[PDB]
Design a protein around this motif. Sequence first.
Motif, PDB file in Angstrom:
ATOM      1  N   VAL A 179       0.823  -1.203   0.000  1.00 45.93           N
ATOM      2  CA  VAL A 179       0.000   0.000   0.000  1.00 45.93           C
ATOM      3  C   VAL A 179       0.857   1.252   0.000  1.00 45.93           C
ATOM      4  O   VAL A 179       0.413   2.313  -0.454  1.00 45.93           O
ATOM      5  CB  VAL A 179      -0.953  -0.026   1.213  1.00 45.93           C
ATOM      6  N   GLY A 182       0.497   2.166  -3.699  1.00 49.09           N
ATOM      7  CA  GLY A 182      -0.780   2.788  -3.450  1.00 49.09           C
ATOM      8  C   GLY A 182      -0.881   4.157  -4.090  1.00 49.09           C
ATOM      9  O   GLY A 182      -1.669   4.376  -5.014  1.00 49.09           O
ATOM     10  N   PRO A 183      -0.086   5.114  -3.606  1.00 43.52           N
ATOM     11  CA  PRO A 183      -0.122   6.449  -4.221  1.00 43.52           C
ATOM     12  C   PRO A 183       0.382   6.440  -5.647  1.00 43.52           C
ATOM     13  O   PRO A 183      -0.146   7.164  -6.499  1.00 43.52           O
ATOM     14  CB  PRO A 183       0.788   7.274  -3.307  1.00 43.52           C
ATOM     15  N   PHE A 236      -2.430   5.807  -7.390  1.00 43.42           N
ATOM     16  CA  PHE A 236      -3.389   6.892  -7.217  1.00 43.42           C
ATOM     17  C   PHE A 236      -3.115   8.018  -8.195  1.00 43.42           C
ATOM     18  O   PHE A 236      -3.995   8.424  -8.964  1.00 43.42           O
ATOM     19  CB  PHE A 236      -3.321   7.413  -5.783  1.00 43.42           C
ATOM     20  N   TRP A 237      -1.886   8.524  -8.193  1.00 50.56           N
ATOM     21  CA  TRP A 237      -1.541   9.665  -9.028  1.00 50.56           C
ATOM     22  C   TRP A 237      -1.618   9.334 -10.511  1.00 50.56           C
ATOM     23  O   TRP A 237      -1.852  10.231 -11.328  1.00 50.56           O
ATOM     24  CB  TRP A 237      -0.148  10.153  -8.675  1.00 50.56           C
ATOM     25  N   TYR A 252      -3.929   7.591 -12.082  1.00 52.42           N
ATOM     26  CA  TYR A 252      -5.302   7.916 -12.448  1.00 52.42           C
ATOM     27  C   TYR A 252      -5.636   9.372 -12.146  1.00 52.42           C
ATOM     28  O   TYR A 252      -6.773   9.784 -12.393  1.00 52.42           O
ATOM     29  CB  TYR A 252      -6.268   6.988 -11.702  1.00 52.42           C
ATOM     30  N   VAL A 253      -4.695  10.099 -11.538  1.00 48.94           N
ATOM     31  CA  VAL A 253      -4.901  11.557 -11.301  1.00 48.94           C
ATOM     32  C   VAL A 253      -4.295  12.256 -12.511  1.00 48.94           C
ATOM     33  O   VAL A 253      -4.955  13.132 -13.093  1.00 48.94           O
ATOM     34  CB  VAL A 253      -4.250  12.008  -9.983  1.00 48.94           C
ATOM     35  N   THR A 258      -6.056  10.911 -15.961  1.00 44.78           N
ATOM     36  CA  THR A 258      -7.372  11.555 -16.206  1.00 44.78           C
ATOM     37  C   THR A 258      -7.179  13.014 -16.623  1.00 44.78           C
ATOM     38  O   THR A 258      -7.815  13.412 -17.602  1.00 44.78           O
ATOM     39  CB  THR A 258      -8.320  11.450 -15.014  1.00 44.78           C
ATOM     40  N   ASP A 259      -6.331  13.767 -15.921  1.00 42.94           N
ATOM     41  CA  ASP A 259      -6.063  15.170 -16.329  1.00 42.94           C
ATOM     42  C   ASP A 259      -5.487  15.197 -17.737  1.00 42.94           C
ATOM     43  O   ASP A 259      -6.047  15.904 -18.574  1.00 42.94           O
ATOM     44  CB  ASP A 259      -5.073  15.879 -15.413  1.00 42.94           C
ATOM     45  N   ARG A 270      -8.160  14.458 -20.148  1.00 45.07           N
ATOM     46  CA  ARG A 270      -9.122  15.578 -20.245  1.00 45.07           C
ATOM     47  C   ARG A 270      -8.476  16.644 -21.120  1.00 45.07           C
ATOM     48  O   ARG A 270      -9.086  17.020 -22.130  1.00 45.07           O
ATOM     49  CB  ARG A 270      -9.447  16.147 -18.859  1.00 45.07           C
TER      50      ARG A 270
HETATM   51  C1  3PE Z   1      -2.194  19.634  -0.903  1.00 47.89           C
HETATM   52  C2  3PE Z   1      -3.168  20.546  -1.614  1.00 47.89           C
HETATM   53  C3  3PE Z   1      -4.116  19.741  -2.493  1.00 47.89           C
HETATM   54  C4  3PE Z   1      -5.050  20.660  -3.270  1.00 47.89           C
HETATM   55  C5  3PE Z   1      -5.942  19.856  -4.207  1.00 47.89           C
HETATM   56  C6  3PE Z   1      -6.678  20.779  -5.169  1.00 47.89           C
HETATM   57  C7  3PE Z   1      -7.665  19.992  -6.018  1.00 47.89           C
HETATM   58  C8  3PE Z   1      -8.396  20.906  -6.992  1.00 47.89           C
HETATM   59  C9  3PE Z   1      -9.605  20.184  -7.569  1.00 47.89           C
HETATM   60  C10 3PE Z   1      -9.189  18.850  -8.171  1.00 47.89           C
HETATM   61  C11 3PE Z   1     -10.406  18.008  -8.531  1.00 47.89           C
HETATM   62  C12 3PE Z   1     -11.274  18.715  -9.563  1.00 47.89           C
HETATM   63  C13 3PE Z   1     -10.442  19.117 -10.771  1.00 47.89           C
HETATM   64  C14 3PE Z   1     -11.315  19.707 -11.870  1.00 47.89           C
HETATM   65  C15 3PE Z   1     -10.459  20.058 -13.077  1.00 47.89           C
HETATM   66  C16 3PE Z   1      -9.549  18.887 -13.418  1.00 47.89           C
HETATM   67  C17 3PE Z   1     -10.369  17.684 -13.857  1.00 47.89           C
HETATM   68  C18 3PE Z   1      -9.457  16.495 -14.006  1.00 47.89           C
HETATM   69  O1  3PE Z   1      -9.132  16.101 -15.111  1.00 47.89           O
HETATM   70  O2  3PE Z   1      -8.947  15.812 -12.830  1.00 47.89           O
HETATM   71  C19 3PE Z   1      -9.152  14.407 -12.725  1.00 47.89           C
HETATM   72  C20 3PE Z   1      -8.732  13.908 -11.353  1.00 47.89           C
HETATM   73  C21 3PE Z   1      -9.183  12.461 -11.215  1.00 47.89           C
HETATM   74  O3  3PE Z   1      -8.768  11.914  -9.966  1.00 47.89           O
HETATM   75  P1  3PE Z   1      -9.621  10.733  -9.287  1.00 47.89           P
HETATM   76  O4  3PE Z   1     -10.801  11.356  -8.584  1.00 47.89           O
HETATM   77  O5  3PE Z   1      -8.677   9.834  -8.525  1.00 47.89           O
HETATM   78  O6  3PE Z   1     -10.164   9.922 -10.563  1.00 47.89           O
HETATM   79  C22 3PE Z   1      -9.795   8.560 -10.757  1.00 47.89           C
HETATM   80  C23 3PE Z   1     -10.869   7.872 -11.590  1.00 47.89           C
HETATM   81  N1  3PE Z   1     -10.654   6.401 -11.583  1.00 47.89           N
HETATM   82  O7  3PE Z   1      -9.353  14.701 -10.346  1.00 47.89           O
HETATM   83  C24 3PE Z   1      -8.631  14.634  -9.089  1.00 47.89           C
HETATM   84  O8  3PE Z   1      -7.419  14.504  -9.113  1.00 47.89           O
HETATM   85  C25 3PE Z   1      -9.379  14.713  -7.781  1.00 47.89           C
HETATM   86  C26 3PE Z   1      -8.401  14.753  -6.613  1.00 47.89           C
HETATM   87  C27 3PE Z   1      -7.644  16.075  -6.568  1.00 47.89           C
HETATM   88  C28 3PE Z   1      -6.674  16.108  -5.396  1.00 47.89           C
HETATM   89  C29 3PE Z   1      -5.722  14.922  -5.450  1.00 47.89           C
HETATM   90  C30 3PE Z   1      -4.888  14.854  -4.178  1.00 47.89           C
HETATM   91  C31 3PE Z   1      -4.123  16.153  -3.956  1.00 47.89           C
HETATM   92  C32 3PE Z   1      -3.312  16.078  -2.669  1.00 47.89           C
HETATM   93  C33 3PE Z   1      -2.444  14.827  -2.678  1.00 47.89           C
HETATM   94  C34 3PE Z   1      -1.439  14.808  -1.536  1.00 47.89           C
HETATM   95  C35 3PE Z   1      -0.680  13.486  -1.532  1.00 47.89           C
HETATM   96  C36 3PE Z   1      -1.675  12.333  -1.516  1.00 47.89           C
HETATM   97  C37 3PE Z   1      -0.997  10.970  -1.474  1.00 47.89           C
HETATM   98  C38 3PE Z   1      -2.055   9.877  -1.420  1.00 47.89           C
HETATM   99  C39 3PE Z   1      -1.440   8.496  -1.236  1.00 47.89           C
HETATM  100  C40 3PE Z   1      -2.536   7.441  -1.152  1.00 47.89           C
HETATM  101  C41 3PE Z   1      -1.965   6.070  -0.863  1.00 47.89           C
END
Ligand code: 3PE
Lengths: 178, 125, 48, 87, 32, 76, 412, 68
Positions: free
Chosen positions: B88, B92-93, B96-97, B99-100, B103-104, B107
């Motif tokens: 994990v 895991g991440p 995660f990223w 598909y982050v 997808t972006d 798009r």
């Molecule tokens: C620290 C500050 C963070 C600030 C975050 C700001 C987010 C702004 C809004 C983002 C979401 C709406 C974006 C609208 C315009 C972009 C549209 C687009 O194309 O984004 C797609 C993306 C898809 O992500 P998801 O929801 O995972 O989809 C997977 C589907 N199977 O959409 C997404 O990515 C949704 C999730 C956005 C945030 C992702 C996490 C950001 C912080 C990550 C920190 C580290 C996390 C480590 C996790 C480890 C897990 C084991």
Amino acid sequence: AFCAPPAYLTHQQKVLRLYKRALRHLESWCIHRDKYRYFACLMRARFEEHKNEKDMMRATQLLREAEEEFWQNQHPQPYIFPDSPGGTSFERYECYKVPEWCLDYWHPSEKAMYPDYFSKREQWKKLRMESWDREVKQLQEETSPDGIMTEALPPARREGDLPPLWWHIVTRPRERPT
Amino acid sequence: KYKPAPLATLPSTLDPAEYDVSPETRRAQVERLSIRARLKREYLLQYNDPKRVSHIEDPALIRWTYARSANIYPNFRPTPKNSLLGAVAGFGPLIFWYYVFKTDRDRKERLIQEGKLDRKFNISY
Amino acid sequence: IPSRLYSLLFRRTSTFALTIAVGALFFERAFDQGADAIYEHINEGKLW
Amino acid sequence: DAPPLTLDGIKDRVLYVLKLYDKIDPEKLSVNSHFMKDLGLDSLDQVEIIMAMEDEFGFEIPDIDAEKLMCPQEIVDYIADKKDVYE
Amino acid sequence: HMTKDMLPGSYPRTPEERAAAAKKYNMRVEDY
Amino acid sequence: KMELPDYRQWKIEGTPLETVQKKLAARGLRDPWARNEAWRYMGGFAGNITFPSVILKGFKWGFAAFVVALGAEYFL
Amino acid sequence: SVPETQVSILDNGLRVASEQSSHATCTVGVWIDAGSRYETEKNNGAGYFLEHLAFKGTKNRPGNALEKEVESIGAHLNAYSTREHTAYLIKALSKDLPKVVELLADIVQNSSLEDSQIEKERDVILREMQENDASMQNVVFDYLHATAFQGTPLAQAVEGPSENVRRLSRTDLTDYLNRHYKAPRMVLAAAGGVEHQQLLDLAQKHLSSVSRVYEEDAVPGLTPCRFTGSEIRHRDDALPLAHVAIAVEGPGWANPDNVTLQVANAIILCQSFQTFNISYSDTGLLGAHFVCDAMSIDDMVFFLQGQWMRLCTSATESEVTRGKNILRNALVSHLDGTTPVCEDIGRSLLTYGRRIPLAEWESRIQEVDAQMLRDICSKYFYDQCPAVAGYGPIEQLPDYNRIRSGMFWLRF
Amino acid sequence: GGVHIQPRYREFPQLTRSQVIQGEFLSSLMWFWILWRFWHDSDAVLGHFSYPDPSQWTDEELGIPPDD
Ligand SMILES: CCCCCCCCCCCCCCCCCC(=O)OC[C@H](COP(=O)(O)OCCN)OC(=O)CCCCCCCCCCCCCCCCC
């Protein structure tokens, strides 16, 4: 900082060290001197009573409810002195307290000036090496029989000898090199 | 009542043990000073020693680093709660990223393909 | 905390029933409303 | 800024304060005179004395080093030793 | 200069090993 | 060498410590360290300081000066 | 109007309590705040084994010559130990008042523990325990204490486990003796034909010098125990009768609603049904013990629980008046003779710190009415998790869900 | 020398001519300025424009017609 920590604390030193934290944490809530000198002689009263309790159990039951009364009636920002641990000047001047074994790597030019200084420094270094033997032997001849051993170190006990392990309590960087 | 948490721990005062000490406890307490006093009079007689140039070692720090970077894999046994948690964390991440970012990036690409993304005054990349 | 609740509406069985009945009376309102929101939105544009 | 202390100016202040404590007679206070065995004060009054000194000289005599400021002189060399006064 | 004997080892399985380690680490055997 | 004011000079009467002294006394208690805390209220620093006094420090001449200036303007 | 119980205090902390009366015989005892609650599982039978060794000779009176002295005046010598208190008491004549006090002084200090005796008293204690299991109600109440106070020093028995009994030595005993026999935790109580000034002079003459300070400021503090709702079931189908005890947490010694709870017990199908309110320092066990044939057990339980819920819900003034009269008779009839009066003086000075007179007990009884009785019973019995201890043919004894469901009513 | 301003023990520190005069000077100018501007420009509290009472506007003025 000077004397060594006792192993366990007595009843007394625990009570008598609350009288300090308490009264000193009463001068944060009560800032003005008068209010204090009043609200404090009333504190002693609290400690003054329950002074002659002979029932240890009780005594350690007044102490344990005193230090909880206190913990919940303490000031968050008490008056801690400027130069004491937790203070505002604590260890401020430590950037200027070099450890004195560093004047030994000075260039013969630097030590050329300041000459009488090094004439007296070489005397003291002769004192230090001249007694390490009599010291360590003392430290050992007088080492305790097997058993409780505290960090207290012995005095001299003979003329000419220097208190055992004295090179770093003496020759300690001046508090405020300024 | 003060309530120690893993942080904001129970103060010395307000700690039950500090108040009810058995003869046994005291003995233990006295012993622990001995170990420290002993160790204290070893450093001090190696620190205050004239005629010394060698490096006082502080082997208690050498036992610490060895325990922390060279005594780890010789004490590794793959269990559960260790491999599930050891996957994990690595994938895991990293999944995660993906598909982050996919997808972006997808798009974005679609929009560029269909003709909506403005990309104005962007003459650099 | 729940304690206050328990000692008041959950410890005496009669009150336990009272809280249950009253809650249920309102739960339906909330559940139906919330549920409908979900269903209708899922099919928005197709109803009527 | 202020002038540095002296082993006789750190002794006149220590005797000064104590001479203003009502319990300690101001004519039997002598620097070699123990607080609890010779002057009469109790244990709680040692804490109070030390604290006065901590407020006359502006620094904190740590607990363990202050459970022993008995003689009215120890206080005068301990304060000075802590403040580096070689006279 | 520090033999492996004086450096960390494996989980003390038997009670004698749990008391041997406590020496290495300069601790009290009942505190390790 | 710096001298030090006679210890005797200090006395609790005439200062707010005295009123604290009298009440603690009703309680039977008597604080022994008061005299030490006397020079606070003893002299020089004896006068009570009122909040208007600080905010209004120098107002007397300030207005005096105000008058003079307005005068010159009046004199044209 | 009973002669008041007069209490004095020595420097040591030994409260000297006495209650003068015309009787010519007196019960002089020493009460020590030391029981199995103060033991730390490494000396779990130290108080019991010291209670065995305390009459086998001292330093001044070596061996049976000591008990020859208590035969010589025709006095009676008794001792007992509970989870919180230890008592050494003598019933004697009035004119033999000094020597008895001196005898008690030896028994508390200057006592001698002979190694020879230690082995003999170990075989006595071991054997008794090996046969103590015979007494069922003792087994059931020990099981109830264990399952109700799991993990605390209140679970462990007064006798201790055979293990410790075998593994005990003079020094250990010496410790318990030197640790839990402090002068501020001791009451010299006298009841009957005694003068308080003479008893105070005798306590000043002997029994000063009793330790008052711990070895290393090692004050043995106490932490309020934890009552645990649980059911322990010892099944042995060869026994003819079954003993079942069900209890809830009690208030403690200093909480006055104990009196009200006592009235509730006075209000309350099995061959034997007894109610108990055992009190320790801010804790206790309040409940019922019944001994029955297997095929009746569940019905008993049902019966019993119904009565408790009736006292929580439907207490009337007539049964409250009957319980108050029963409690008045119980208190005054218990305070009869020099031995129970001395026992009450010792327990009152150890627990309350004072001797509560019978007029105060009568006032606290007459202030109890039906409304506060059902309020206090709902506070302590209604919807509470009980501790259950069964021994014998206890298969039809219901398990914990049925008893816990019987601890409340769906109709309130 | 080591004493530029003799330290004082439990006494009111002696003050230099200049310390008092400069202090009264800065404060007095503060008050001269506050008074001078208040006289010359008193529109700090009052404001030089009077709020209209929005509730005294003849409906005619506000184009409020008379119910057709
Ligand atoms: C620290 C500050 C963070 C600030 C975050 C700001 C987010 C702004 C809004 C983002 C979401 C709406 C974006 C609208 C315009 C972009 C549209 C687009 O194309 O984004 C797609 C993306 C898809 O992500 P998801 O929801 O995972 O989809 C997977 C589907 N199977 O959409 C997404 O990515 C949704 C999730 C956005 C945030 C992702 C996490 C950001 C912080 C990550 C920190 C580290 C996390 C480590 C996790 C480890 C897990 C084991």
